C-alpha cells in the first residue's frame, strides 16, 4: 500500500491514543449495513483492547441536523465510519478531534480524513469503511483484520478475490494467524442449516434451479443421492464429492476462496458474518450485530440467526413471486411491479438475485418498482456486461426522475428513484429512451 | 490413486478420535523428533484444535518399552503414536484405553491389537520408504476431521526424503488433495534454501538439496560466482532484477539441472518459506532438542518463536558448512570397495551423517564408492555409512554389511541399504573397515 494511505493511518491512531490516555469516552458514528456495522466493530474492539470506553450510534443516513446536535455533546473524539466525506466542512464545525473513515466519492484543522479515493485507490473495488477503519487502528490492534474483510464482502468488493488494500489486509491477517483460507463450496450457513436449506439460501454465488426453492433443492439432492436433511460436514465424503462436481455444473463460481477466522467458528465463514450483520441492519437491530463483532455469543447469536432465517424466507417469497409473475420488457429495459407490502423493503435485493439466477435476463437492465402510497420507489439493477456496453443507471434515473419532479441517482450498476405514481409509464418510457441512447 | 484398505483404516482411526473428543478428554500424542515426527504430531494437534479438543504432545528420540510401561500409569484414554509404534505393538497392546499407531517403518510380525488402530503403508501394499511418511499416515487418520493440514503431511514427507522425481504414491494423492482444497500451490522455480529470509549469497551457500557443486557450503565461492556473473550478491532472491534473475536460472541449471523444478508453497507458511524450507526449520529444531518451538510452528505461532527457530537453523547451517569445509580440505581415504573419513572433533560428532551425504551429492567425494563417516566417542567410534542409489543397484546394502561387521567385534549395527549406522570399539576400527570392505566387494 502507498505510504500516504498508511501515514494517515498513523495520525488517526495517534489521535485515538491522546483521548484514550485522557480517559475520554470515544464517539463512534457509523452506517447500518455490514460495512458500517463491522467498521464500528473494528473501532470498538481497538478501543476495548486498551481498556478504553466507547459509545456507538448507527444511522441509516447522516444529515447535518444530527451533526448540529452532536456539537452540543461532551465527547472529545468523533469517529465516523462509512460516512463523513460528503459533510466535511459541516463536520469541521465540530470541535474536539474528529476521524472520518469513509470510502465514498469525496466532495479540517482538527479532522483526520482517511479515504482511498484521496490516495489513488478505488473505494468501490478495493477498500471499504471497515478496511479504512482498520488502517486507522492497525497500530493499536491487528486482531480485528478479519472484520475489515466482512465489511468488504458486505459491500461486494470481491469478484476474483480481494484486490488492492483489501488484499494487503487479507495477507496481513494471514501472516498474523487470525485468518485462514481454503477453497470449498461457498454455501450459505454450512454449520447451522441442513444441506437442503443451505443450498436454497445460497443467493451469492447463485445456483440457478436451486437457490430460493426448497422443494427443488430437496428433489435435486434426493435424485442425486445425498442426505438432504443433514448439515454439510455431517454427510459422507463419497456423498460430498457428488455435490462438488454437481454444483459446479450449475454455477462454477460456487467453488472458490472461503475465509474462516477462529473467533467466528461455529457461526460461519467471513461471508456468512456479512449475511448475519446485513439481516441485523435491515431489522434495525443494531446492538445485536455489534455484539457479534464484539464477541457476544449466547442468546444474541440465537436472535441474530432467527433474524436471518426470517429475512431469508422473505427473499424466497420473494424470488417465487418473480419466477411466477415475471418481468415485462420494453426495448432497452425490463421491469417488475409490486404493491405488496412484503416486497417493499427487499425489491432491490430480489431484483439483483433474479439476474444472477437467470430467472430474468441479465443482459437487459431491470427496474424493480414498489408503490408507496401516491409515489413509487424504483430500484434499478443490472450486470457488469450491460455496463460495458454503455449503461449508467444512476445518470438515466436521476435525469428521468428529475423531469417529473422526483429525486433519483446512484451508481452505474445500481440506482434508485422516487416518482409520482401517475407518471410511472412515462418515466419508464423515458428511462428506456435514455438507456437506448447510452448503448447505441 | 489410493487403496480402499488404506482409507477404510483411515476412517476407523478418525471415528475413534471423535468418541474421545466428544467424551471431553485430553488426547495423548507421542511422536518422533525429526521433521516427519514433529510435523505428524502437528497434523494431529491441528485436527484436534479444529474441534475445540485438547491435546498433550511428547517428543522422543526413541521409543522404549520403559516409556510405554510408564504410560500405562497415566489416565489419558486415547494414545496417538506417530512415526513409531509398529516395532512395539504387543507392548503397546498392554496399554488400555484406545490407541492409534500412525507409523511407516517395517512392521514387526505380531500384529496384535483389540483396541489398537494400526495404520502403516507396508500393510496395504505401498512403500513406506518412497511413498508415505508418518505425517501422511497421520493425515490419513485425520482426513475426515480436517483437510487443512495436508501441506504439513508433505513437510514430513520431504523431511524423510520421499521426493526424487516428485511425490509418488500416497504422497501424490495428498499433494493433489491439497491442491483441489486450495491450501497448497505449485510452481516451478529455482529451489534455493530460504529465498525470503536470506540474501542470494547465503541462500545459494545453504542450498544443500539439491546440491550445487562449487557453491553449496562455501560463502566466498558463492560470492565470487555471483560477482563475476553480475547478480546482486547482497540482496534477497525476489529483490533482484528479472534480467539479473534469468542469468541465475540458466547458470545454476548448468551446475545441477535438478535445481529447477517443483516448489511447494502454502499461504500459512508464507514469509517463512516453501514446504521444504519448513522441513529444514523443523529438523534444526529437533537436532537442538527444542521441541515446543517446532510444534508451535506447525500450530501457527509466529512471533518470537519463528525468530528463535530461524536462529537455530542459521547455527545448524554454519556447523554443516564447517563441516563440508573440513571434508573439502583433508578428504577421504579409499580402500578397495569403500572410502572413509574420520573425526575426533566435537563439532562434527552429531552431523557426521548429514555432511557425509551432502559431500556425495556435491561430488567432493566420489558418489559411486560407498562412504563411511567415523566419529570417536571416547573408547568407541560411531559409524554413519552413506551411499547413492546407483551404488545400491550394483548390489550394495550397508545395513547388512554394517550389522554383520559391527556384530563380529561385539558392537551393534544396522539400518537400510542406502544408509546405515554402527558403533564399534576404537581399537577394532581398522579391522572393521577391512571387514566392511570385504563384505561390500562380495555384495557387488
Ligand atoms: Mn460501505
Ligand atoms: Mn455502507
Ligand atoms: Mn518417518
Ligand atoms: Mn522420523
Amino acid at each position: 500500500l502507498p505510504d500516504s494511505i498508511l501515514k494517515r493511518g498513523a495520525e488517526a491512531s495517534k489521535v485515538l491514543e491522546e483521548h484514550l490516555e485522557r480517559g475520554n469516552i470515544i464517539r463512534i458514528i457509523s452506517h447500518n449495513d455490514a460495512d458500517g456495522l463491522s467498521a464500528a466493530g473494528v473501532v470498538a474492539r481497538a478501543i476495548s483492547s486498551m481498556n478504553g470506553q466507547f459509545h456507538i450510534s448507527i444511522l441509516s443516513r447522516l444529515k447535518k441536523e444530527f451533526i448540529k446536535k452532536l456539537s452540543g455533546e461532551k465527547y472529545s473524539l468523533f469517529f465516523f465510519c462509512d460516512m463523513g466525506s460528503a459533510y466535511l466542512e459541516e463536520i469541521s464545525r465540530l470541535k474536539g478531534d474528529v476521524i472520518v473513515a469513509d470510502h465514498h466519492q469525496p466532495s479540517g484543522p482538527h479532522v483526520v480524513h482517511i479515504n482511498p479515493h484521496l490516495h489513488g485507490l478505488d473505494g468501490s473495488r478495493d477498500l471499504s469503511a471497515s478496511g479504512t477503519a482498520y488502517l486507522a487502528t492497525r497500530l493499536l490492534n491487528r486482531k480485528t483484520a478479519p472484520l475489515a474483510l466482512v465489511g468488504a464482502l458486505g459491500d461486494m468488493q470481491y469478484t476474483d478475490g480481494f484486490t488492492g488494500a483489501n488484499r494487503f489486509i487479507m495477507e496481513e491477517a494471514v501472516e498474523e494467524g487470525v485468518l485462514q483460507v481454503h477453497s470449498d463450496l461457498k454455501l450459505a450457513s454450512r454449520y447451522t442449516e441442513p444441506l437442503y436449506r443451505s443450498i436454497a439460501y445460497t443467493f451469492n454465488p447463485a445456483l440457478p434451479g436451486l437457490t430460493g426453492d426448497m422443494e427443488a433443492s430437496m428433489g435435486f439432492l434426493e435424485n442425486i443421492g445425498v442426505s438432504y436433511g443433514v448439515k454439510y460436514p455431517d454427510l459422507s465424503p463419497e456423498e460430498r464429492d457428488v455435490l462438488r462436481d454437481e454444483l459446479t455444473r450449475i454455477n462454477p463460481e460456487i467453488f472458490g476462496e472461503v475465509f474462516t477466522s477462529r473467533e467466528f467458528r461455529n457461526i460461519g465463514d467471513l461471508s456468512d458474518i456479512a449475511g448475519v450483520l446485513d439481516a441485523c441492519g435491515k431489522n434495525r437491530k443494531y446492538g445485536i450485530g455489534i455484539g457479534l463483532c464484539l464477541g457476544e455469543r449466547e442468546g444474541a447469536l440465537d436472535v441474530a440467526l432467527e433474524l436471518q432465517k426470517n429475512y431469508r424466507e422473505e427473499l424466497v417469497k420473494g424470488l417465487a413471486w418473480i419466477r411466477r409473475e415475471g418481468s415485462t420488457t420494453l426495448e432497452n429495459l425490463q421491469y417488475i411491479y409490486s404493491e405488496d407490502k412484503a416486497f417493499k423493503g427487499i425489491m432491490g435485493t430480489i431484483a439483483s438475485i433474479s439476474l444472477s439466477l437467470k430467472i430474468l435476463d441479465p443482459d437487459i437492465p431491470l427496474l424493480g418498482l414498489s408503490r408507496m402510497d401516491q409515489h413509487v420507489k424504483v430500484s434499478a439493477r443490472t450486470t457488469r456486461p450491460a455496463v460495458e456496453r454503455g449503461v449508467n443507471l444512476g445518470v438515466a434515473l436521476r435525469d428521468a426522475a428529475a423531469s417529473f419532479g422526483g429525486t433519483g441517482g446512484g451508481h452505474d450498476i445500481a440506482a434508485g428513484a422516487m416518482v409520482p405514481y401517475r407518471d410511472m409509464e412515462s418515466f419508464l418510457q423515458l428511462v428506456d429512451e435514455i438507456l437506448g441512447t447510452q448503448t447505441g
Side-chain angles (χ1 to χ4, degrees), chain A residues 205-214 216-219:
Chain A
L207 290 151
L210 281 20
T211 295
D213 226 328
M214 288 279 156
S217 296
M218 188 169 283

Side-chain angles (χ1 to χ4, degrees), chain A residues 236-237 241-248 250-261 263-264 268-283 285-295 299-305 307-308 310-313 315-316 318-324 326-330 332-340 342-343 345-357 359-363 365-373 375-388:
Chain A
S236 82
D241 278 291
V242 173
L243 211 47
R244 196 209 166 167
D245 270 34
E246 292 280 317
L247 297 183
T248 327
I250 295 174
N251 175 0
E253 308 270 326
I254 194 68
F255 196 85
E257 282 177 328
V258 167
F259 294 86
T260 56
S261 163
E263 86 206 44
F264 302 115
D269 66 82
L270 294 207
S271 95
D272 289 359
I273 308 310
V276 173
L277 294 188
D278 274 317
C280 286
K282 315 295 173 156
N283 267 257
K285 224 109 187 42
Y286 316 133
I288 296 303
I290 278 156
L292 265 32
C293 301
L294 294 168
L301 180 51
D302 298 17
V303 172
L305 290 173
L307 285 188
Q308 184 174 44
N310 296 319
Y311 183 59
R312 289 168 164 180
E313 301 169 28
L315 288 182
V316 168
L319 296 155
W321 171 66
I322 297 174
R323 268 184 173 97
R324 133 179 87 270
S327 85
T328 91
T329 303
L330 303 186
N332 306 121
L333 70 71
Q334 76 195 301
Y335 70 88
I336 215 159
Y337 176 71
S338 192
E339 291 170 62
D340 191 287
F343 315 141
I346 60 158
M347 189 55 71
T349 320
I350 64 186
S352 278
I353 295 156
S354 52
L355 304 165
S356 290
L357 289 167
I359 290 160
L360 301 185
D361 193 349
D363 303 312
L366 167 60
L367 276 59
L369 312 181
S370 302
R371 202 206 230 257
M372 299 235 165
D373 193 357
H375 298 275
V376 46
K377 184 153 161 278
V378 183
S379 319
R381 300 280 188 286
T382 195
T383 62
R384 287 248 40 103
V387 177
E388 289 181 348

